[PDB]
């Protein structure tokens, strides 16, 4: 539908040939709206040399800047540590000789235009980590497990602690780190201490003992803590940097189980707890807004002990939507989706014009299943996992199969433009895919064993496609790079050409600026209610107590949203109902439509929580607003609050007070 497209692309396609790119090759973008890309290489000659290339134009042209690093061998293990935001910081870690006291880094503050070499008073063991508040503050662990901090972008270091296993930056330049006191990190597991320093090593506070590990998610600090006189451990949560802790209402686990924070934001967390006896699955729980009371969201959630692969995916392009895989009772794998932050999970709706595959019991009734990390790890023919971007609202693209379970067959690519409610087959056969200019353009490359020289693109969100031949020397295709954030109209195609005699790495960068030659205006956008189920209901669209309508680009408009495009939306607040509340600790919601009632008996970890929980959390009316829930007016449960503590501890003989 695009006219003269070949002529509009041909003078905007840019080839670069890399003279040498053997070994591990990596690419990092430096900053937003800079067009800066660094390509680094590392190979050994076994019976070490590194190459560094830099673009400042979104990959159209590179310059060999290997000379800047004195042709030194860069260790790929540490990668390029790119600083936050647009600080323009880059640190590369070098291999030193065997004589050396400490290692060596090459540091740049101007987007890798210039580097200086700095010799370290230690040998780094981890990648260097920037404070998110301050790109000049770095921390790093040494090979001797010292924790070292720098206040001047790695110019000078000081070791603030000697026996450290893990360290991370919190907010406001805070450091949390675990320490061992006995022998090694591994032999002191479960008896580590957790420390905090708010002032870069001047003061410390020990905020936990008998630690196994710790992590940060949203507003929460999580620590797993081992029960003394025991081999099991439990999660404890703090929202004040470990000044105070509460036990979370979650099962304890043995040494062969794990917890994993699937996703976390300012409101809540999704926690996975592995099932006992390494069955390769566990259960998803969602927290309230305190990170303390957890609701079982999804049983038999697939998460493998080998490598730790899970299909859990936030569909970033529609609020509330997540997708994952679960094991059926027959041990086939199905895809499930939730539209309300894990309150309910369902099968994905089959594309109207799809045929049910061989996994389907019924040839007229089946569902869509999605290939993701686990499929890829099992060596299925799946080039990419599912793609969605916050700024291209409603769009999700993924390889999938239509049936009753995930198939081993070669998959096709499906797209949804409503956040996952409905799907269509987008392309036949496996492809690599990218979204450019906030959904203004979708691009795809065929995944082949033979060389390719065509790229497909759509300006109407994957409904109609045009094919451009971007080279007359077909390449073995390796990968697509585009600027993080999906707001660019540049896409780079990477691969290599092979002859009998020789081969060579090549990139082609294509600029769509002449296809999308006009800016979108107000008339190019149309109102769209997200989550619509039934247009006859005044509450159609309500999720977590509010609806949103978006101004979405019309499919038929062919125009650029723009690098400064802002997703325009307008909320409507829904009335509160009982569905906007979670059962608080001690209560549940039996068979039907939504009244939280006292549990008759507390067993298992509920019983543990009652004995170990604070009054604050044990005093309740049985309801708590779903976190992120924005309803106003309507039902407001007025049952009076009671201490459930008295209920359980009532059975126990108490010792003297």
């Amino acid at each position: 539908r695009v006219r003269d497209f070949v002529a509009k692309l041909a003078n905007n396609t840019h080839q670069h040939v890399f003279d040498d790119l053997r070994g591990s090759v990596s690419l990092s973008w430096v900053g937003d709206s800079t067009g800066v890309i660094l390509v680094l290489t590392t190979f050994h000659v076994p019976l070490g040399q590194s190459k560094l290339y830099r673009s400042e134009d979104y990959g159209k042209n590179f310059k060999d800047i290997t000379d800047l690093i004195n042709n030194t061998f860069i260790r790929t293990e540490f990668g390029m540590a790119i600083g936050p935001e647009n600080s323009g910081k880059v640190v590369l870690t070098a291999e030193v000789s065997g004589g050396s006291r400490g290692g060596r880094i090459f540091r740049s503050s101007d987007f890798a235009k210039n580097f200086v070499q700095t010799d370290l008073p230690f040998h780094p063991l981890t990648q260097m980590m920037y404070s998110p508040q301050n790109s000049d503050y770095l921390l790093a662990l040494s090979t001797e497990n010292g924790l070292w901090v720098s206040k001047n972008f790695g110019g000078k270091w000081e070791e603030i602690h000697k026996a450290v296993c893990l360290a991370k930056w919190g907010s406001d330049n805070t450091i949390f780190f675990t320490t061992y006191a006995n022998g090694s990190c591994k032999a002191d597991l479960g008896a580590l201490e957790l420390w905090r320093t708010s002032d870069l090593g001047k003061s410390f506070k020990t905020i936990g003992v008998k630690i196994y590990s710790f992590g940060l998610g949203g507003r929460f600090l999580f620590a797993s803590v081992m029960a003394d006189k025991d081999t099991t451990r439990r999660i404890h949560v703090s929202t004040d940097q470990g000044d105070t802790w509460s036990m979370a209402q979650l099962p304890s686990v043995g040494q062969e189980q794990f917890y994993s924070i699937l996703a976390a934001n300012d409101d809540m967390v999704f926690m996975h707890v592995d099932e006992p006896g390494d069955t390769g699955f566990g259960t998803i729980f969602t927290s309230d807004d305190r990170g303390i009371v957890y609701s079982k969201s999804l049983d038999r959630h697939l998460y493998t002990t080998t490598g730790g692969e899970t299909d859990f995916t936030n569909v970033t392009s529609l609020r509330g939507v997540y997708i994952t895989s679960v094991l059926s009772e027959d041990n086939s794998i199905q895809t499930m989706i939730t539209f309300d932050q894990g309150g309910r999970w369902t099968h994905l709706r089959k594309p109207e014009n799809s045929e049910c595959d061989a996994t389907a019991k019924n040839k007229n009734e089946c569902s869509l299943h999605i290939h993701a990390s686990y499929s890829i790890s099992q060596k299925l023919n799946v080039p990419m996992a599912p793609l969605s971007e916050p700024n291209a609202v409603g769009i999700v693209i993924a390889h999938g199969s239509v049936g009753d379970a995930i198939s081993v067959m070669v998959p096709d690519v499906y797209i949804s433009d409503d956040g996952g409610y409905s799907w269509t087959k987008m392309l036949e056969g496996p492809h690599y895919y990218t979204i450019l200019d906030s959904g203004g353009i979708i691009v795809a490359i065929e995944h082949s064993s033979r060389p390719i020289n065509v790229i497909k693109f759509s300006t109407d969100e994957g409904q109609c496609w045009q094919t451009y031949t971007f080279t007359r020397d077909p390449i073995y295709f390796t990968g697509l790079a585009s600027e993080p954030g999906a707001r660019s109209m540049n896409i780079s195609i990477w691969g290599f050409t092979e002859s009998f005699l020789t081969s060579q790495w090549v990139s082609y960068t294509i600029d769509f600026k002449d296809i999308l030659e006009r800016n979108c205006e107000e008339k190019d956008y149309t109102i769209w209610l997200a989550h619509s189920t039934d247009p006859e209901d005044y509450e159609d669209g309500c999720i977590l107590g509010y609806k949103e309508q978006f101004l979405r680009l019309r499919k038929s408009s062919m125009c650029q949203n723009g690098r400064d495009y802002v997703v325009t939306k307008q909320p409507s607040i829904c009335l509160c109902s009982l569905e906007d509340f979670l059962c608080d600790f001690g209560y549940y919601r039996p068979e039907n439509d939504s009244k939280c009632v006292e549990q008759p008996e507390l067993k298992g970890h509920d019983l543990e929580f009652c004995l170990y929980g604070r009054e604050e959390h044990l005093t309740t009316n049985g309801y708590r607003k779903i976190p992120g829930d924005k309803c106003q007016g309507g039902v407001n449960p007025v049952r009076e609050v009671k201490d459930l503590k008295k209920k359980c501890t009532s059975n126990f003989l108490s010792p003297e007070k």
Binding site: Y212, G215, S260, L262, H272
Partner: peptide, 4 residues
């Protein structure tokens, strides 16, 4: 994801 983040293991504990």
């Amino acid at each position: 994801p983040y293991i504990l």
